[PDB]
Amino acid sequence: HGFVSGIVADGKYYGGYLVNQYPYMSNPPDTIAWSTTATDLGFVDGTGYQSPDIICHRDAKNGKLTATVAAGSQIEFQWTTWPESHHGPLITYLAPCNGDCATVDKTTLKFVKIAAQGLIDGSNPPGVWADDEMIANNNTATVTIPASYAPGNYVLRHEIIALHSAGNLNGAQNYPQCFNIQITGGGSAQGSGTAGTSLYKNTDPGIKFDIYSDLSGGYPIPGPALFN
Ligand SMILES: *[C@@H]1O[C@H](CO)[C@@H](O)[C@H](O)[C@H]1NC(C)=O
Numbered sequence: 568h569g570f571v572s573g574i575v576a577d578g579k580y581y582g583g584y585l586v587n588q589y590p591y592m593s594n595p596p597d598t599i600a601w602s603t604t605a606t607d608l609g610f611v612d613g614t615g616y617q618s619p620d621i622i623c624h625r626d627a628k629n630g631k632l633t634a635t636v637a638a639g640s641q642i643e644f645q646w647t648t649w650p651e652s653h654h655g656p657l658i659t660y661l662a663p664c665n666g667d668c669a670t671v672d673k674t675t676l677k678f679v680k681i682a683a684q685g686l687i688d689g690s691n692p693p694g695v696w697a698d699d700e701m702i703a704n705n706n707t708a709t710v711t712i713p714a715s716y717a718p719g720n721y722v723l724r725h726e727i728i729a730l731h732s733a734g735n736l737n738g739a740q741n742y743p744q745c746f747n748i749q750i751t752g753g754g755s756a757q758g759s760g761t762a763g764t765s766l767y768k769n770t771d772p773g774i775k776f777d778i779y780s781d782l783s784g785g786y787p788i789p790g791p792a793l794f795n
């Protein structure tokens with residue numbers, strides 16, 4: 568259970584969608600982060616993989632602001648304190664808004680996987696994962712925006728998949744957080760995206776996954792192919 572409280576882009580801090588505060592007000596602050604109704608700091612599980620909730624978490628609604636970021640530079644995502652039990656991958660995507668992200672219909676977004684980290688050391692189940700490294704780094708995850716990416720308006724979708732209960736069907740817990748960004752500089756490249764409601768199936772091997780048994784077979788990070 569947790570959420571992204573803010574991000575750093577081009578070295579500038581942007582406050583996120585404070586889901587434990589902003590829903591409890593008529594007129595919360597503007598943010599680059601999408602609003603959600605996930606006030607229990609909870610998740611979308613496999614029962615919702617085909618729901619609009621998987622896109623940006625949820626009942627999510629477009630953030631009002633947009634952060635500029637140079638292609639080829641780093642974004643830091645500051646999570647709230649992440650529980651050790653919730654081992655799993657960190658996956659980050661870009662979807663073009665093809666227009667203004669403040670008004671794009673989220674149901675139309677097609678996400679390209681730009682970063683993904685999974686099982687780091689599975690010598691001893693339940694293993695050490697991407698989220699374990701995030702915990703150790705002041706509950707912060709980092710990605711690089713590809714240097715060759717086309718300049719434009721994008722939804723940045725950053726997600727933890729907790730796998731502590733993932734041996735159960737629909738037991739994997741997805742924690743997507745979305746932000747509006749404007750990539751500057753860059754090149755001409757873009758991936759071919761996947762609708763949010765097409766990212767995952769509850770039968771995918773990295774979704775219906777047992778962290779507690781021998782990990783000699785590794786961990787197949789779910790979702791579409793990683794962009795190069
Ligand atoms: C740790 O993260 C918090 C937000 O969770 C941030 O406010 C603080 O500045 C960070 N500490 C360091 C040393 O960067």
Ligand SMILES: [Cu+2]
Pocket residue numbers: 568569650653
């Ligand atoms: Cu939890």
